[PDB]
């Protein structure tokens, strides 16, 4: 599908509310495999299971390894802009 920009709002006491799978070492993008109910990704409305995360706050996630992506995503705070694509 089309490349989408999606805004997520979160406070520092909570996580993003997503589970991710994949990574370059698996030949798979960083994929959202779970949206957890009532947590920031669910609340923002624009992120879906099966979305590939290409970037977050302008930080590239293309061709990142799984744990590289975990560190990058978990560092983001406040108003977070996701660049995602559903394939």
């Amino acid at each position: 599908g089309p490349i989408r920009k999606v805004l997520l709002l979160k406070e520092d006491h909570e996580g993003l509310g997503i589970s991710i799978t994949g990574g370059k070492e698996h030949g798979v993008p960083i994929l959202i495999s779970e949206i957890h109910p009532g947590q920031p990704a669910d609340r923002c409305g624009g992120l879906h299971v099966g979305d590939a995360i290409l970037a977050v706050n302008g930080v590239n996630l293309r061709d990142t390894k799984h744990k590289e992506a975990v560190t990058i995503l978990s560092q983001q705070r406040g108003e977070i802009e996701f660049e995602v694509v559903y394939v």
Binding site: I18, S19, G22, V28, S33
Partner: peptide, 8 residues
């Protein structure tokens, strides 16, 4: 289960 999954 071949792929890793992380909750974030």
């Amino acid at each position: 289960s071949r792929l890793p999954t992380s909750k974030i």
